[PDB]
RNA sequence: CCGUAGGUGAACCUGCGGAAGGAUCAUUA
RNA sequence: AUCAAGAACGAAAGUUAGGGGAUCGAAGAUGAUCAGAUACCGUCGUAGUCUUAACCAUAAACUAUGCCGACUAGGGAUCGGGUGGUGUUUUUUUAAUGACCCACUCGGCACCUUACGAGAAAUCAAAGUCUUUGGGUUCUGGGGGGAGUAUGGUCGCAAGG
């Protein structure tokens, strides 16, 4: 089997996690791209790395891969806070201002000493 | 059957201290258990203890703090001489600074130091340290 | 040893009963019997929420008692818990552990996941039990969020809540965050509600 | 209660138990049966004088082949015959 | 040179911890050996046993050397360490590190009267490891260490001089005997004596008061 | 202990556990030092001074460290109606 | 293997009753 | 409460004297076979197996764990009894019960987690409360064979204990 070496794999992983956008589906541009950005000592190894970056540009255009890309990581930096609801489920208007509370928790409310808009609901089994 | 009542009392105290609680339920009572826990109390090895009446024979609550690493009973109540006090004081105590042997003497129940300085002896019950 | 303003404000009690924190599991351990008040007769117990408020008041005092705010570490592996602890670590400056907590992180200084805390918060002590037992080796207090059938060993100041629902865990992390920022001094007025809503901590799966 | 009668009036069962349980020692059984006087060919004595009888060339294989240069000896005081080792001689030219 | 990695290392490398009483009082685990190296100049290692052990792995027979190393002050500090290595010097080296990590203090007390320096153990402690119980009794002054030479050598490497020992079980394995005697001599702090009833205000931890030095960068 | 002359001859007098009054010894690596900062009247914590607890590993390995620590906080005036003196 | 009985046998087999000191997979409520 | 002496019971097989003797079936009578994967296989089958009267007193008679008493963990169950329910069902018209459910409660057969504690470990709510060694009591063991042999006694018709 022609399993590629780990140096070519790791160099392609670094150059695609950091230098994504100028690499494309054409190997011939990627050859002098990795010439102009990377100092690789031999023509054979830089051909290996440029062909592997071409192949990872081939399958990256169909979907996301487990490795790091920037243009997704801004997006899960506003995924943390962009979907704040104006009214949550914990607000009063989703139950018309009066809570759906059984008799025992209303006994907790009247025993602890607080005033609260509760509707007693009778539940069994 | 239940042979000694002091033995089950002190075994219950030792078990409830080795599991680390702060209160026991000693059952039943005697003169001997009451006076034994008074001997522990005068040295401050236990805190409050409390006696509940029930008209049969009373249950005792002892609120033990932490201070008793082991008390115990010597169940064949051997007759001890004045000169035999050093043998039990060397065999069951940790060292020569603390640690007590409780005797029943004809002047009453007292520890081994009080039996030394009373200059009496009697029969051995147990040991509190 | 606390002022009288610190207690249950009724909007927080409405907020607590809105998130269904008072509902719990079916087994009641010997240790956590005082947290239950009584049982709704299907098999679901209801918990004293004043105990949850004052217990998280203790946990807030533990977190505020540390001198270095980066030395407290939040632990999570539940799906709601990663979002909850990253919001808490964003808002108080704690060090979060999201996803798989690395074994050998509390001993074994070689690993780059070695952090030694002085204080550890855990989402539940059953699924994140390995951080509990590795913190049991290097003398660390752990304040935790325990259910009514959680393992109660090796925890101290444990907050009864519901770890099953996303409402209760996101809210209870939010309330711990707002309690410690109201206790540190970032929000001066005790009367003023905190500007961030609790639904920021809430998990959504798209 | 660990299986012994710890009563203050219980010396007799302990003492009969210790008397009957001391027959499991081999040394006690040798001393209070007179084993050293009836089957011991020395008669329980540290030495015994003898008159030699033969030359025993016993071969004794494993693990060490001992070329046994030893003498059958008839004792004097009792008239029974024991074997006897001769030490330190390579030749046994002395005990004829 | 040496770099610390934890807060306990950088406090003593900055010289803020005086001795190892402040480690033992707050029960911080000693995690690197340089803490005990810097805090204790007077530690004398002494090698106990060298045992060649034949080792088999994947039809490969090689010989490893099991080493028993005890370290100790002439004060009350005892370290014991068990490590097997391929070579002799590496085995005794890993012995003095592993004994240097686990150092446990000893409560030295008085037999009977109260004259002079402490000379013996305070109370009788036992210890079990394997099938071996070793019981250490307090002794009068100048009585020597009445012991097997292994546990005797452990006890003049301990700061005591006067102990009677009593043992049981198969004590012909010196690893389990020295382990049980180490547990027994470490068990002395842990007997609640009547002259320590006195309640004390609890000291604040050194990590709390000295929080802004020894911090991670 | 103490000698005759009036000078303490000890290495260290150990930390007693605040639950069961037992000795936290040196290798007790499950032991916990609990720090609670008391509060100012306007809801702030003075970062220098504290109330203080110590729990032995014996109590913590069981799991009544919560219940014993609730008792400690309530009898130190910090809590009310959480731990109950009866059951 | 044990207990009992029998034919024998250079060993050993067989009748009746016990024990595991012998190795619970899958499936379902 | 525990137990020398003494006594009752004691699986299977065995023993005497009867009844029965379907099936199974040690002994025996018979066939084989053909190979060193190998005689287990077959068919009659007596004793027996079944019962009555009397013996016999051994087993891996095992939970391989003396008996009584106290303490040290819970919970899912279950068996027998009891308590309570503006609980259910069974209707006739509401009950009564009967059955089912819940919360208990004693008293049994068992389970699962631990470890505080034990042990050499496997493992153990006892195999814990034991070098910090004592609740009461009965029996047994002291390296392995020789050997449950020799001999003496004792019971039994004998086999045998
Ligand atoms: Mg021996
Ligand atoms: Mg066997
Ligand atoms: Mg008999
Ligand atoms: Mg038998
Ligand atoms: Mg023999």
Full 3-state SS string of E148-178: CHHHHHHHHCCCCCEEEEEEECCCCCHHHHH
C150 vs C28: CA distance, rounded Å: 9
Residues listed for chain E? 217
CA angle (B36, B40, B46) in 5-degree steps: 125
DSSP three-state, residue A101: strand
Concatenating the DSSP letter of every residue in F2-16 gives: --SSS----S-PPEE
Q: Is there a single domain that holds both residue B13 and residue B62? A: yes
End-to-end CA distance of chain C: 46
Count of alpha carbons within 13 angstroms of residue B116, beta-carbon side: 10
Nearest C-alpha in B relative to F18: B66
C130 vs C171: CA distance, rounded Å: 25
Specify the DSSP class assigned to residue B84: T
Residues 57-86 on chain F lying near strand H, CB distance under 7 A: 58, 61-62
Q: In what order do the strands lie in the sheet with D70-75?
A: D50-52, D70-75, D81-85
> CB contact, 8 Å: C49 with chain A?
yes
Tokens matching residue B23: 């209160």
Q: Which residue has the tokens 């030359």?
A: D55
In the listed set B18, B41, B68, which residue is the last one of a domain according to the structure? B68
Element (H, E) at D15: helix D11-20
| Residue C6 in domain | no
Residue E85 alpha carbon to ligand 3 centre in Å: 62
- Does the CB of B23 fall within 7 Å of any strand H atom? no
Q: Do chains E and F touch (3 or more CB pairs under 8 A)?
A: yes
Main-chain phi, psi angles of E95, to 5 degrees: -65, -40
Return the domain boundaries, chain E. Answer: 1-105, 106-199
User: E106-199 — its CATH code?
Assistant: 3.30.230.10
Q: Hey, are the CB atoms on B44 and E112 less than 8 Å from each other?
A: no
Task: Write out C44-85 in H/E/C secondary structure.
Answer: EEEECHHHHHHHHHHHHHHHHHCCCCCCEEEECCCHHHHHHH
- Does the CB of B2 fall within 7 Å of any strand H atom? yes
Element (H, E) at E137: strand E132-138
A80 vs A60: CA distance, rounded Å: 25
Residue E133 alpha carbon to ligand 2 centre in Å: 28
Angle between helices A43-60 and A27-37 (to 10 degrees): 120
Q: How far is CA B70 from the centre of its chain?
A: 10
**Length C88 CA → H150 C1' (Å):** 91
Element (H, E) at D83: strand D81-85
Residues preceding gaps in chain F (C to N > 2.5 Å): none
b/e map of C124-151 (b: 16 or more CB within 10 Å)? bbeebbbbbebbbebbbbbbbbbbbebb
Q: Is the distance from CB of C121 to CB of C131 less than 8 angstroms?
A: no
Determine how β-strand B122-128 pairs with β-strand C44-47: unpaired
List CB contacts (< 8 A) between F23 and chain E: 189-192
How determined?
cryo-EM
List CB contacts (< 8 A) between B63 and chain F: none
Q: At CB < 8 A and 24+ separation, what contacts does D6-12 make? A: D6/B75, D6/B76, D7/B76, D8/B76, D8/B77, D8/B78
**Length C42 CA → H90 C1' (Å):** 24
Please give the torsion angle defined by the CA atoms of residues B35, B37, B40 and B44, in that order, rounded to the nearest 10 degrees: -120
Tokens matching residue E82: 């068990």
**Length C42 CA → H94 C1' (Å):** 30
The residue range of the domain holding D56 is: 1-96
Q: Is there a single domain that holds both residue B55 and residue B90? A: no
Main-chain phi, psi angles of E162, to 5 degrees: -140, 95
Tokens matching residue B102: 């409780």
Q: How many domains does chain B have?
A: 2
**Length B94 CA → H72 C1' (Å):** 25
- Does the CB of E167 fall within 7 Å of any strand H atom? yes
Q: Is the distance from CB of B102 to CB of B32 less than 8 angstroms?
A: no
Residue C169: CB atoms within 10 A of its CB come to: 28
Q: Is the distance from CB of C145 to CB of C85 less than 8 angstroms?
A: no
Q: Which residues contact A102 (CB under 8 A, 6 or more apart)?
A: A120, A121, A122, A123, C40, C46
Please give the torsion angle defined by the CA atoms of residues A24, A28, A32 and A35, in that order, rounded to the nearest 10 degrees: 90
Main-chain phi, psi angles of F72, to 5 degrees: -65, -40
Q: Which residues contact E27 (CB under 8 A, 6 or more apart)?
A: C139, F15, F24, F25, F26, F27, F28, F29, F31
The residue range of the domain holding C156 is: 12-206
**Complete domains list, chain F, with CATH:** 1-87 (3.30.1230.20)
Note the helical H segments in chain B.
Answer: 5-18, 31-42, 85-91, 112-118
Q: Which residues contact A36 (CB under 8 A, 6 or more apart)?
A: none
CA of E174 vs chain B CAs: smallest distance (Å) = 27
Residue D78: CB atoms within 10 A of its CB come to: 11
Q: How many domains does chain D have?
A: 1
Angstrom CA distances, B15 to A77, B24, B25, C77, C177, stand at: 58, 10, 12, 40, 44
Count of alpha carbons within 13 angstroms of residue A40, beta-carbon side: 22
| Residue C188 in domain | yes
Residue D24 alpha carbon to ligand 1 centre in Å: 18
CA angle (B62, B65, B68) in 5-degree steps: 90
- Does the CB of B92 fall within 7 Å of any strand H atom? yes
Q: Which residues contact F13 (CB under 8 A, 6 or more apart)?
A: E196, E200
Residue C67: CB atoms within 10 A of its CB come to: 16
Q: Hey, are the CB atoms on F21 and B20 less than 8 Å from each other?
A: no
CATH code, domain carrying C109 = 3.40.50.10490
Cis peptide before D31 (omega within 30 of 0): no
- To test the contact with chain B by mutation, choose from E162, E187, E192, E195 the residue with the greatest count of B C-beta atoms within 10 A, namely E192
Please give the torsion angle defined by the CA atoms of residues F49, F51, F54 and F60, in that order, rounded to the nearest 10 degrees: -120
CATH code, domain carrying B44 = 3.30.1370.30
Residue E48: CB atoms within 10 A of its CB come to: 18
Tokens matching residue B48: 């409050």
Element (H, E) at A77: helix A75-78
Tokens matching residue E190: 């842990």
C16 vs C161: CA distance, rounded Å: 10
- Number of helices (H), then strands (E), in chain A: 6, 2
Q: In what order do the strands lie in the sheet with E44-56?
A: E44-56, E61-72, E77-85, E103-105
Beta bridge pairs of residue D81: D74
Specify the DSSP class assigned to residue E115: -
Specify the DSSP class assigned to residue D95: -
Which CATH architecture best describes the domain E1-105?
A: 2-Layer Sandwich (3.30)
Q: Is there a single domain that holds both residue B48 and residue B111? A: no
DSSP three-state, residue B52: strand
CA of C34 vs chain F CAs: smallest distance (Å) = 7
Residue F13: CB atoms within 10 A of its CB come to: 15
The residue range of the domain holding B60 is: 1-68
Element (H, E) at B110: strand B108-111
Q: How far is CA D90 from the centre of its chain?
A: 28
Nearest to residue F17, comparing CAs of C17, E192, E44? Answer: E192
Q: Which residue has the tokens 């009572």?
A: B29
Q: How many domains does chain C have?
A: 1
Main-chain phi, psi angles of B78, to 5 degrees: -70, 150
Count of alpha carbons within 13 angstroms of residue C20, beta-carbon side: 11
Concatenating the DSSP letter of every residue in chain C gives: ---GGGS--HHHHHHHHHTT-SB--S---STTGGGEEEEETTTEEEE-HHHHHHHHHHHHHHHHH-S-TTSEEEE--SHHHHHHHHHHHHHH--EEE-SSPPSSSSS-TTSTT----SEEEES-TTTTHHHHHHHTTTT--EEEEE-SSS--TT-SSEEE--SSSHHHHHHHHHHHHHHHHHHHTSS--SSSPPSS-GGGS-----
Instruction: Give resolution in angstroms.
Output: 3.8
B73 vs B104: CA distance, rounded Å: 13
A76 vs C87: CA distance, rounded Å: 13
Residue E209: CB atoms within 10 A of its CB come to: 12
């Amino acid at each position: 089997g022609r399993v590629r070496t780990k140096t070519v794999k790791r160099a392609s992983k670094a150059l695609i996690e950091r230098y994504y956008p100028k690499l494309t589906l054409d190997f011939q541009t990627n050859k002098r791209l990795c010439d102009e950005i990377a100092t690789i000592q031999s023509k054979r190894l830089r051909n290996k790395i440029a062909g592997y970056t071409t192949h990872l540009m081939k399958r990256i255009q169909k979907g996301p891969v487990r490795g790091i890309s920037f243009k997704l990581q801004e997006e899960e930096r506003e995924r943390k806070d962009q979907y704040v609801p104006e009214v949550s489920a914990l607000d009063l208007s989703r139950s018309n201002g009066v809570l759906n509370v059984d008799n025992q928790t209303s006994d907790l409310v009247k025993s602890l000493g607080l005033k609260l808009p509760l509707s007693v609901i009778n539940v069994s089994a | 059957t239940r042979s000694s009542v002091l033995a089950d009392a002190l075994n219950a105290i030792n078990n409830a201290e080795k599991t680390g609680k702060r209160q026991v339920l000693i059952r039943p009572s005697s003169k001997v258990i009451i006076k034994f826990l008074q001997v522990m109390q005068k040295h401050g090895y236990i805190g409050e203890f409390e006696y509940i009446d029930d008209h049969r024979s009373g249950k005792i609550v002892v609120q033990l703090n932490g201070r008793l690493n082991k008390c115990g009973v010597i169940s064949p109540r051997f007759n001890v001489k004045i000169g035999d006090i050093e043998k039990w004081t060397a065999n069951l105590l940790p060292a020569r600074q603390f640690g007590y042997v409780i005797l029943t003497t004809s002047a009453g129940i007292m520890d081994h130091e009080e039996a030394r300085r009373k200059h009496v002896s009697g029969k051995i019950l147990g040991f509190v340290y | 040893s606390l002022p009288a303003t610190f207690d249950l404000t009724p909007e927080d009690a409405q907020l607590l009963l809105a998130a269904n924190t008072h509902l719990g599991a079916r087994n009641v351990q010997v240790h956590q019997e005082p947290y239950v008040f009584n049982a709704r007769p299907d098999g679901v117990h209801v918990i004293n929420v004043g105990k949850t408020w004052e217990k998280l008041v203790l946990a807030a005092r533990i977190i505020a008692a540390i001198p270095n705010p980066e030395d407290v570490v939040a632990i999570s592996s539940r799906t709601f818990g990663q979002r909850a602890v990253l919001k808490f670590a964003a808002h108080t400056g704690a060090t979060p552990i999201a996803g798989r907590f690395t074994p050998g992180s509390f001993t074994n200084y070689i690993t780059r996941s070695f952090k030694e805390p002085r204080l550890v918060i855990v989402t539940d002590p059953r699924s994140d039990a390995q951080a509990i037992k590795e913190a049991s080796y290097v003398n660390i207090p752990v304040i935790a969020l325990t259910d009514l059938d959680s393992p109660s060993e090796f925890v101290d100041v444990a907050i009864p809540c519901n770890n099953r629902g996303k409402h209760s865990i996101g809210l209870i992390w939010y309330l711990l965050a707002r309690e410690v920022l109201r206790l540190r001094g970032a929000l001066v007025d005790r009367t003023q509600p905190w500007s961030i809503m609790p639904d920021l901590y809430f998990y959504r799966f798209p | 209660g660990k299986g012994k009668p710890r009563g203050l009036n219980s010396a007799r069962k302990l003492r009969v138990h210790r008397r009957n349980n001391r027959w499991a020692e081999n040394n006690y059984k040798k001393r209070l049966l007179g084993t050293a006087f009836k089957s011991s060919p020395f008669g329980g004595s540290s030495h015994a004088k003898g008159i030699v009888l033969e030359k025993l060339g016993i071969e004794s294989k494993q693990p060490n082949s001992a070329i046994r240069k030893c003498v059958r000896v008839q004792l004097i005081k009792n008239g029974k015959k024991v074997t006897a080792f001769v030490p330190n001689d390579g030749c046994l030219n002395f005990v004829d | 040179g040496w770099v610390p990695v934890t807060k306990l290392g950088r406090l003593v490398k900055a010289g803020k911890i005086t001795t190892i009483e402040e480690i033992f009082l707050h029960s911080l685990p000693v995690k690197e050996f340089q803490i005990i190296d810097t805090l204790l100049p007077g530690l004398q290692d002494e090698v106990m046993n060298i045992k060649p052990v034949q080792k088999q792995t994947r039809a490969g027979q090689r010989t490893r050397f099991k080493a028993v190393v005890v370290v100790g002050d002439s004060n009350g500090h005892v370290g014991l360490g068990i490590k097997t290595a391929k070579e002799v010097a590496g085995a005794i080296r890993a012995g003095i590190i592993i004994a240097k990590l686990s150092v446990i203090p000893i409560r030295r007390g008085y037999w009977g009267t109260n004259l002079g320096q402490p000379h013996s153990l305070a109370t009788k402690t036992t210890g079990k490891c394997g099938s071996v119980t070793v019981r250490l009794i307090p002794a009068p002054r100048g009585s020597g260490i009445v012991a097997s030479p292994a546990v005797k050598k452990l006890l003049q490497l301990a700061g005591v001089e006067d102990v009677y020992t009593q043992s049981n079980g198969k004590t012909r394995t010196l690893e389990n005997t020295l382990k049980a005697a180490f547990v027994a001599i470490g068990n002395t702090y842990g007997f609640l004596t009547p002259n320590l009833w006195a309640e004390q205000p609890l000291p604040v931890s050194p990590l709390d008061i000295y929080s802004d030095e020894a911090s991670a960068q | 202990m103490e000698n005759d002359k009036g000078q303490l001859v000890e290495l260290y007098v150990p930390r007693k556990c605040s639950a069961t009054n037992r000795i936290i010894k040196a290798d007790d690596h499950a032991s916990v030092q609990i720090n609670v900062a008391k509060v100012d009247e306007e809801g702030r914590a003075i970062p220098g001074e504290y109330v203080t607890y110590a729990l032995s590993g014996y109590v913590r390995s069981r799991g009544e460290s919560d219940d014993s620590l609730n008792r400690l906080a309530q009898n130190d005036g910090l809590l009310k109606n959480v731990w109950s003196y009866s059951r």
